RNA sequence: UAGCCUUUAUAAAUAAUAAUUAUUAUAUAAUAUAUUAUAUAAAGAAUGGUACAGCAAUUAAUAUAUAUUAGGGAACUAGUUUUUUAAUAAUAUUAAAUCUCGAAAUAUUUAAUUAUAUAUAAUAAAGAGUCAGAUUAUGUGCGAUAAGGUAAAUAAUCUAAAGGGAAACAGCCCAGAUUAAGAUAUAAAGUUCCUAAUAAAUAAUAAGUGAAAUAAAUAUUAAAAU
RNA sequence: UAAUAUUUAAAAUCAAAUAUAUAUAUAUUUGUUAAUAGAUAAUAUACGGAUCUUAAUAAUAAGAAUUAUUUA
RNA sequence: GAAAGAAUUAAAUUAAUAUAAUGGUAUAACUGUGCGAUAAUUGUAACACAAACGAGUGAAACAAGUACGUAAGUAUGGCAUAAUGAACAAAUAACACUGAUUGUAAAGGUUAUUGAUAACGAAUAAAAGUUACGCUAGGGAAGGGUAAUAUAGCGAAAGAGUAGAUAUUGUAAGCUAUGUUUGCCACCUUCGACUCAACAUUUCCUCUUGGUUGUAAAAGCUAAGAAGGGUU
RNA sequence: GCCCGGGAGUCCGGGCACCA
């Protein structure tokens, strides 16, 4: 091989969703090699160490006192509140299921059970 | 050593390794009532080198060790590879026994009352043999092992015998203290000048 | 013994790069930390090749040899390998073969300095002038009490500078990471981490 | 090759023009600041004339404007040196300097602070 | 095929573009050592590792009547001293495409607000052309810090852009021609004549240096400063 | 004040100016050489050309068309 | 005041990671061990990243079963990023889907799997040369630039020169000029002889001159002015 | 992949399909 001339393409990894941005459950937030960012509140981590939203909400980047020397990406459930959330204050959950008003639907639901 | 903060690069920098060496060293505390030198543990390692060829030799060595001490040894495997000597990793070679408490005391007594005396030309342990944090070591040839009670009683049973190293760990802060302590237990240090 | 031929293990080719024009006012390698009299670059930064350096060195040496307890030390080393294509060959077909070693020299850097109780400063100056002739820039003689070249028409004294303690500064105006660390160190967090 | 007949110096007229341009830029900034101040005054509860009069004029808060106001970062024309009105720092010139008039759109571009020693 | 262009249109449509607020600290005032309001300073929400800066770790370079480890040579009666040889340690100094512990600006970029609505985005139904570009400036790779060279990156112009300037001029500097008209502002450029338009001030130059394309080391002569 | 050996600097220093409490202090900003030689090829001198450097005695009168810093 | 325990702090890091390099990793992904060989299972996969399409990547959730775990939970192979190949035509199984007059079948389809086109979006199952006897359509899909080399000149001076760098010489390194050589670039598509020469000066001769322990003279050497005439 | 030649196993050489 007199000349070299081989190389791979860029991988397009990096942040795909920025502080303040509204994610939806599933949306990929960060692509990375290794964990330069760690999953925080309401955030999952896939096989690539890709961070993604577990819930609808607002993306925030933070430093967690419990974990010094680690950067966190998380989803705050609503905009107003900060994300490295007070340790002892009750955890803000979503619930986020709707109730079957339509009577037939409700009946069906009632009927259906595990196998 | 911590970094002088005369530049901004020092800020989140790991400290400088010790002026003398790579490794960090302990503080020498003064010898008071609370921390007098004492015998901590005796480790015996018999690395039979001829066991590179014959693996039964290792077993025999281990048995010998057991006989000498009265507590189960543990096998010593060859941790490295080297062509010059016929050495390949993953090869059982010799036995290592950790002696503590009463057992270790017993062993030491046996060494001092019987063996070290009986060995023909022994001029005592070398004074340079200090670990430097209060550890002392010395060898025994393949011949001297015959002088132990458990072996001497049946020479018919032990055709091959294997030499060994003996390491003695002490609660001593420094080597000289340790050697003084050892002398108390009848260890001749006439081997050299410190 | 080998400032002109540094022994890197992996002999690897190197992109041409550019000679730094130290804009933040470096002052690094611009003072004479040993020796009495020195030889500094006066002009724009230049790439000095090993051969040139050697020739300069040899020129200087003849002046020093006579002196009792007189010696010359070389401040810069030719660390950058240069590959040159054969003249006859055309463009393409990759990079050329390793030719020689060079060193990028910023504007105010000291190439050499000397000392030797016996030596008269005039002689030293002369020597340095002679050395200069072998090198591809314009050079200036420096003494132990001559102010440092920062730019190419600008000087400074290193003794007049802000002696800061940077830890203190950091504490005063802290980064986020540091703050986080401090918080972590604080009692409750330490207690409740449960690792 | 192809003859781009552009001189290494500037004519006096050109220099004057440059100076004027510089002054104008400064003036714009000043005007902006003034406007901001009077807005602030009005918010507080004053008339236009009163605001104009006021001794304690308010500095601007927005970062950019503040930076512009600082003479360390963005000099005014009278403050500025001759060597910086008609030359820029070129990293690859002889003398590390180059006439501003060589800079692509120098009539629009602003560029005051050359490096400290270069 | 996507990208860039066009036509017609759609709307529980402002999503588009631009900036601002967002942070930290200080001072003052008011309430409960905290919170709010006002002022001021700070390259000021979040993302980042280039310049610069640095030599920490990694990779390299230098210097020791310094320390240790052995060797060579040497003196007196194996011990010893000196002269060192190499290595390691110590202290000082240095640099790098594939080192960054410090670290810009520009940049990516978020919600709300304000400004752009004769405006932008999105979507739907239809159409295309284009896929040998060029130069300038900036930061690069290749070349020899050669090329009106070559390869990509960013911005502009040219391509497809007439007008004024750059003597003449694709790509430079200004400026975008619907049609006139020619009074007033002017842009870049100029103002002795050619050639539209000029008067001053302070210095320096005596070479026609120079007057729109700056030729180097160095030498001589003078001038200032210490 | 003569001779003497470097340097061609506003970093330091001094002077001046602006912003902050203000007759001071703090912070920022600006102010530091010139000639000559070196110098050079082929149709023709080649700033585009003419040409431009000033002077008493005298002009209701010219005084750089160069370089640097400016004004109207 | 001691012993033991729980630790905590510092250092953590280039050790180790199936495998290159990078990023990560002690809160361990790294190592040891118990159980387990089960998530190296089965239907729907929203939504993102990426992206011309074909493809690729992460993945919440719903349902079926399994493993470990006191539980919380965790597992849809491997710490991450490589480890790959379209359709067509064949082949093997399952499906109960059509069955060309009806019934069977054949054949096709659905689902699952198999072998390659490395010129790796693969023209065919199957393919090398030569033409200076050639032909057609087209495209250009010495000069100009550069000065590495060459020639020429300067600055400094190692060294020659019976002595002494600078009469004369002048290593390697420095700074330039020329576009007379060998190249490079791709804006652009014949060497000699004869005849006649024109122009230049970096002057071979002739004219003037400076230096020359190396100008006694004569011959020279070297340098300055000089292109009028001449130069087989 | 299947079949040979030199009970099982290894090590070698022939064919026979596959060759889209
Ligand atoms: Mg890559
Ligand atoms: Mg650097
Ligand atoms: Mg032109
Ligand atoms: Mg198209
Ligand atoms: Mg880089
Ligand atoms: Mg094409
Ligand atoms: Mg080109
Ligand atoms: Mg065209
Ligand atoms: Mg035009
Ligand atoms: Mg346009
Ligand atoms: Mg128009
Ligand atoms: Mg002239
Ligand atoms: Mg000119
Ligand atoms: Mg001419
Ligand atoms: Mg002109
Ligand atoms: Mg690693
Ligand atoms: Mg694992
Ligand atoms: Mg797609
Ligand atoms: Mg093929
Ligand atoms: Mg193909
Ligand atoms: Mg073929
Ligand atoms: Mg040609
Ligand atoms: Mg040519
Ligand atoms: Mg001549």
PDB file of N, CA, C and O (backbone and C1' of nucleotides) in Angstrom, chain G residues 78-94:
ATOM      1  P     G G  78     -25.393  -7.095  23.760  1.00  0.00           P
ATOM      2  O5'   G G  78     -23.960  -7.559  24.275  1.00  0.00           O
ATOM      3  C5'   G G  78     -23.772  -7.902  25.658  1.00  0.00           C
ATOM      4  C4'   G G  78     -22.480  -8.640  25.854  1.00  0.00           C
ATOM      5  C3'   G G  78     -21.213  -7.810  25.688  1.00  0.00           C
ATOM      6  O3'   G G  78     -20.224  -8.358  26.561  1.00  0.00           O
ATOM      7  C1'   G G  78     -21.214  -9.538  24.108  1.00  0.00           C
ATOM      8  P     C G  79     -19.165  -7.426  27.338  1.00  0.00           P
ATOM      9  O5'   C G  79     -19.942  -6.050  27.520  1.00  0.00           O
ATOM     10  C5'   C G  79     -19.422  -5.055  28.410  1.00  0.00           C
ATOM     11  C4'   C G  79     -19.844  -3.676  27.972  1.00  0.00           C
ATOM     12  C3'   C G  79     -19.783  -3.388  26.479  1.00  0.00           C
ATOM     13  O3'   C G  79     -20.943  -3.831  25.784  1.00  0.00           O
ATOM     14  C1'   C G  79     -18.760  -1.627  27.656  1.00  0.00           C
ATOM     15  P     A G  80     -20.884  -4.072  24.203  1.00  0.00           P
ATOM     16  O5'   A G  80     -20.739  -2.598  23.623  1.00  0.00           O
ATOM     17  C5'   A G  80     -21.843  -1.680  23.674  1.00  0.00           C
ATOM     18  C4'   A G  80     -21.455  -0.351  23.074  1.00  0.00           C
ATOM     19  C3'   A G  80     -20.954  -0.387  21.638  1.00  0.00           C
ATOM     20  O3'   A G  80     -22.045  -0.487  20.729  1.00  0.00           O
ATOM     21  C1'   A G  80     -19.535   0.978  22.929  1.00  0.00           C
ATOM     22  P     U G  81     -21.949  -1.454  19.456  1.00  0.00           P
ATOM     23  O5'   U G  81     -21.110  -0.592  18.415  1.00  0.00           O
ATOM     24  C5'   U G  81     -21.585   0.691  17.986  1.00  0.00           C
ATOM     25  C4'   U G  81     -20.451   1.499  17.410  1.00  0.00           C
ATOM     26  C3'   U G  81     -19.678   0.858  16.272  1.00  0.00           C
ATOM     27  O3'   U G  81     -20.357   0.957  15.029  1.00  0.00           O
ATOM     28  C1'   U G  81     -18.173   1.849  17.800  1.00  0.00           C
ATOM     29  P     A G  82     -20.805  -0.372  14.268  1.00  0.00           P
ATOM     30  O5'   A G  82     -19.441  -1.179  14.116  1.00  0.00           O
ATOM     31  C5'   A G  82     -19.440  -2.485  13.520  1.00  0.00           C
ATOM     32  C4'   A G  82     -18.319  -2.605  12.522  1.00  0.00           C
ATOM     33  C3'   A G  82     -18.204  -3.965  11.843  1.00  0.00           C
ATOM     34  O3'   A G  82     -19.043  -4.017  10.688  1.00  0.00           O
ATOM     35  C1'   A G  82     -16.056  -3.166  12.543  1.00  0.00           C
ATOM     36  P     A G  83     -20.424  -4.847  10.705  1.00  0.00           P
ATOM     37  O5'   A G  83     -20.060  -6.212   9.975  1.00  0.00           O
ATOM     38  C5'   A G  83     -18.747  -6.480   9.454  1.00  0.00           C
ATOM     39  C4'   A G  83     -18.244  -7.807   9.964  1.00  0.00           C
ATOM     40  C3'   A G  83     -19.289  -8.736  10.574  1.00  0.00           C
ATOM     41  O3'   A G  83     -19.922  -9.503   9.561  1.00  0.00           O
ATOM     42  C1'   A G  83     -17.345  -8.672  11.933  1.00  0.00           C
ATOM     43  P     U G  84     -21.304 -10.236   9.848  1.00  0.00           P
ATOM     44  O5'   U G  84     -22.286  -9.545   8.803  1.00  0.00           O
ATOM     45  C5'   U G  84     -22.438  -8.115   8.786  1.00  0.00           C
ATOM     46  C4'   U G  84     -22.271  -7.568   7.386  1.00  0.00           C
ATOM     47  C3'   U G  84     -22.895  -8.375   6.260  1.00  0.00           C
ATOM     48  O3'   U G  84     -24.307  -8.205   6.169  1.00  0.00           O
ATOM     49  C1'   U G  84     -20.724  -7.727   5.623  1.00  0.00           C
ATOM     50  P     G G  85     -25.174  -9.207   5.268  1.00  0.00           P
ATOM     51  O5'   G G  85     -24.798  -8.761   3.788  1.00  0.00           O
ATOM     52  C5'   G G  85     -25.388  -7.594   3.183  1.00  0.00           C
ATOM     53  C4'   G G  85     -25.563  -7.822   1.702  1.00  0.00           C
ATOM     54  C3'   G G  85     -26.064  -9.215   1.309  1.00  0.00           C
ATOM     55  O3'   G G  85     -26.980  -9.136   0.229  1.00  0.00           O
ATOM     56  C1'   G G  85     -24.130  -8.711   0.105  1.00  0.00           C
ATOM     57  P     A G  86     -28.158 -10.201   0.076  1.00  0.00           P
ATOM     58  O5'   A G  86     -29.446  -9.267   0.025  1.00  0.00           O
ATOM     59  C5'   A G  86     -29.310  -7.830   0.053  1.00  0.00           C
ATOM     60  C4'   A G  86     -30.264  -7.183  -0.921  1.00  0.00           C
ATOM     61  C3'   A G  86     -31.181  -8.127  -1.682  1.00  0.00           C
ATOM     62  O3'   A G  86     -32.243  -8.513  -0.820  1.00  0.00           O
ATOM     63  C1'   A G  86     -30.225  -6.599  -3.195  1.00  0.00           C
ATOM     64  P     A G  87     -33.301  -9.598  -1.295  1.00  0.00           P
ATOM     65  O5'   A G  87     -34.144  -8.803  -2.381  1.00  0.00           O
ATOM     66  C5'   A G  87     -35.066  -9.498  -3.219  1.00  0.00           C
ATOM     67  C4'   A G  87     -34.935  -9.028  -4.643  1.00  0.00           C
ATOM     68  C3'   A G  87     -35.128 -10.094  -5.709  1.00  0.00           C
ATOM     69  O3'   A G  87     -36.500 -10.420  -5.855  1.00  0.00           O
ATOM     70  C1'   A G  87     -33.269  -8.776  -6.269  1.00  0.00           C
ATOM     71  P     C G  88     -36.973 -11.926  -5.669  1.00  0.00           P
ATOM     72  O5'   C G  88     -36.760 -12.545  -7.120  1.00  0.00           O
ATOM     73  C5'   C G  88     -36.911 -11.735  -8.299  1.00  0.00           C
ATOM     74  C4'   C G  88     -36.128 -12.315  -9.451  1.00  0.00           C
ATOM     75  C3'   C G  88     -36.058 -13.832  -9.534  1.00  0.00           C
ATOM     76  O3'   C G  88     -37.250 -14.340 -10.129  1.00  0.00           O
ATOM     77  C1'   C G  88     -33.897 -12.929  -9.830  1.00  0.00           C
ATOM     78  P     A G  89     -37.960 -15.656  -9.544  1.00  0.00           P
ATOM     79  O5'   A G  89     -36.930 -16.803  -9.938  1.00  0.00           O
ATOM     80  C5'   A G  89     -36.612 -17.034 -11.320  1.00  0.00           C
ATOM     81  C4'   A G  89     -35.505 -18.047 -11.443  1.00  0.00           C
ATOM     82  C3'   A G  89     -35.687 -19.314 -10.619  1.00  0.00           C
ATOM     83  O3'   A G  89     -36.510 -20.217 -11.345  1.00  0.00           O
ATOM     84  C1'   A G  89     -33.506 -18.459 -10.292  1.00  0.00           C
ATOM     85  P     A G  90     -37.270 -21.395 -10.585  1.00  0.00           P
ATOM     86  O5'   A G  90     -36.082 -22.396 -10.232  1.00  0.00           O
ATOM     87  C5'   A G  90     -36.018 -23.004  -8.935  1.00  0.00           C
ATOM     88  C4'   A G  90     -34.702 -23.709  -8.728  1.00  0.00           C
ATOM     89  C3'   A G  90     -34.642 -24.537  -7.449  1.00  0.00           C
ATOM     90  O3'   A G  90     -35.160 -25.837  -7.701  1.00  0.00           O
ATOM     91  C1'   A G  90     -32.885 -22.981  -7.427  1.00  0.00           C
ATOM     92  P     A G  91     -36.427 -26.359  -6.877  1.00  0.00           P
ATOM     93  O5'   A G  91     -35.761 -26.896  -5.535  1.00  0.00           O
ATOM     94  C5'   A G  91     -34.559 -27.683  -5.595  1.00  0.00           C
ATOM     95  C4'   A G  91     -33.829 -27.636  -4.276  1.00  0.00           C
ATOM     96  C3'   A G  91     -34.678 -27.836  -3.027  1.00  0.00           C
ATOM     97  O3'   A G  91     -35.016 -29.205  -2.834  1.00  0.00           O
ATOM     98  C1'   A G  91     -33.217 -26.023  -2.690  1.00  0.00           C
ATOM     99  P     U G  92     -36.509 -29.614  -2.427  1.00  0.00           P
ATOM    100  O5'   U G  92     -36.467 -29.570  -0.835  1.00  0.00           O
ATOM    101  C5'   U G  92     -35.440 -30.269  -0.105  1.00  0.00           C
ATOM    102  C4'   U G  92     -35.322 -29.738   1.305  1.00  0.00           C
ATOM    103  C3'   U G  92     -36.611 -29.624   2.103  1.00  0.00           C
ATOM    104  O3'   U G  92     -37.107 -30.877   2.564  1.00  0.00           O
ATOM    105  C1'   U G  92     -35.334 -27.673   2.420  1.00  0.00           C
ATOM    106  P     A G  93     -38.681 -31.185   2.497  1.00  0.00           P
ATOM    107  O5'   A G  93     -39.280 -30.228   3.621  1.00  0.00           O
ATOM    108  C5'   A G  93     -39.575 -30.733   4.935  1.00  0.00           C
ATOM    109  C4'   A G  93     -39.371 -29.665   5.984  1.00  0.00           C
ATOM    110  C3'   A G  93     -40.630 -28.976   6.496  1.00  0.00           C
ATOM    111  O3'   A G  93     -41.376 -29.795   7.392  1.00  0.00           O
ATOM    112  C1'   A G  93     -39.001 -27.341   6.046  1.00  0.00           C
ATOM    113  P     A G  94     -42.865 -30.266   7.004  1.00  0.00           P
ATOM    114  O5'   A G  94     -43.764 -29.053   7.512  1.00  0.00           O
ATOM    115  C5'   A G  94     -44.065 -28.902   8.911  1.00  0.00           C
ATOM    116  C4'   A G  94     -44.050 -27.446   9.309  1.00  0.00           C
ATOM    117  C3'   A G  94     -45.341 -26.673   9.068  1.00  0.00           C
ATOM    118  O3'   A G  94     -46.328 -26.889  10.070  1.00  0.00           O
ATOM    119  C1'   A G  94     -43.531 -25.409   8.259  1.00  0.00           C
TER     120        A G  94
END
